[PDB]
């Protein structure tokens, strides 16, 4: 944003937005799967209690 004029900057910024959004989708997807694993251990621990 300091180095490029707006209509060129938007092309570079949208690459970062694409890749950073893809990074959050990767994180949240894998955390949702990990949460399901922890849920199973929690249901087991509750049953053993």
């Amino acid at each position: 944003l300091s180095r490029l004029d707006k209509v060129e900057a938007e092309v570079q910024i949208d690459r970062l937005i694409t890749g950073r959004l893809q990074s959050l989708q990767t994180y949240v997807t894998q955390q949702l799967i990990r949460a399901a694993e922890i849920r199973a251990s929690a249901n087991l621990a509750a049953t053993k209690m």
Partner: protein, 49 residues
């Protein structure tokens, strides 16, 4: 919904400045088009007139 016809005379070397995201004496200080411009630019040599 509406149409606006704008007309003016400039140097042949300045015609290249009449586009979205352009810069220069004409684009900067005479006639600036928006980044999301939806119109058409038409120009012809008038050295005869």
């Amino acid at each position: 919904t509406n149409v606006y016809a704008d007309s003016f005379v400039i140097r042949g070397d300045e015609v290249r400045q009449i586009a979205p995201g352009q810069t220069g004496k004409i684009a900067d200080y005479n006639y600036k088009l928006p980044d999301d411009f939806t119109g058409c630019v038409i120009a012809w040599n008038s050295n005869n007139l």
